[PDB]
Every structure is written in C-alpha cells, then in structure tokens.
C-alpha cells in the first residue's frame, strides 16, 4: 500500500494476457483500452509487482509479482511480454517512450532482486 510500496515508474499501455487455449491475446480484465501501469517496490522486503489500472474506469487489470530471475522479452519497441507459471502477460505501449520507461524500471528491478 501507500506506506510500504513506492512507484518506480508509470507507463501507458494496453495490458493483455495470452489465451493459449485459443492462441490469441485477450484484454486484461475483459475490455480493450489503455491503462496506467506501475512497477511498485516494497522497500522493506525488496519485492516488486506490476499494477495497472484502466484510464477510463480505474479497473485493476494486472497485479502480478515480479520474481527474481524473470525473463522479460522486448518483442518489439512497443510490445513487451513476460510469463509466470500461470499466465503470459503483454504490454502494448502507447509510445516508444512509455516502453523505454517501463523496460528500464523492469530491468532495474530484475538487477536488484
């Protein structure tokens, strides 16, 4: 929360998860559109998570831990992705600048974990 976590970036992206059973990307949270996506650092425990909220209605569309060792794939200059044991996540960034902001924060998190 506000007293144990610090936002280390904010980036504009359409958040998606991969539907492997259908072999297609789905909008995270059910509806297509752009979100403000943060990486939050829990400063006491040195852990990180990605939290994103839809710009229009504030729905939380992603809330996932970043584990030590994660492989973050920059597929293109505006679409980056990663996976966990459960889901595959994708960020379709609103601009190259947003992708750079997020990727630079992610790579930082992965270095200090």
């Amino acid at each position: 929360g506000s007293m144990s976590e610090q936002s280390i970036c904010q980036a504009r992206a359409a958040v998606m998860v991969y539907d492997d059973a259908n072999k297609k990307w789905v909008p995270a949270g059910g509806s297509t559109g752009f979100s403000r996506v943060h990486i939050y650092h829990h400063t006491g425990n040195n852990t990180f998570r990605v939290v994103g909220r839809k710009i229009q209605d504030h729905q939380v569309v992603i809330n996932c831990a970043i584990p030590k060792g994660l492989k973050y794939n920059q597929a293109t200059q505006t679409f980056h992705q990663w996976r966990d044991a459960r889901q595959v996540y994708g960020l379709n960034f609103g601009s190259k600048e947003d992708a750079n902001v997020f990727a630079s924060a992610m790579m930082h998190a992965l270095e200090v974990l």
């Binding site: 929360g1 506000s2 829990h42 998570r49 939290v51 939380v60």
Partner: peptide, 4 residues
C-alpha cells in the same frame, strides 16, 4: 488499490 489492491493488495498483492
């Protein structure tokens, strides 16, 4: 804002 959600818990983790």
């Amino acid at each position: 804002x959600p818990p983790x």
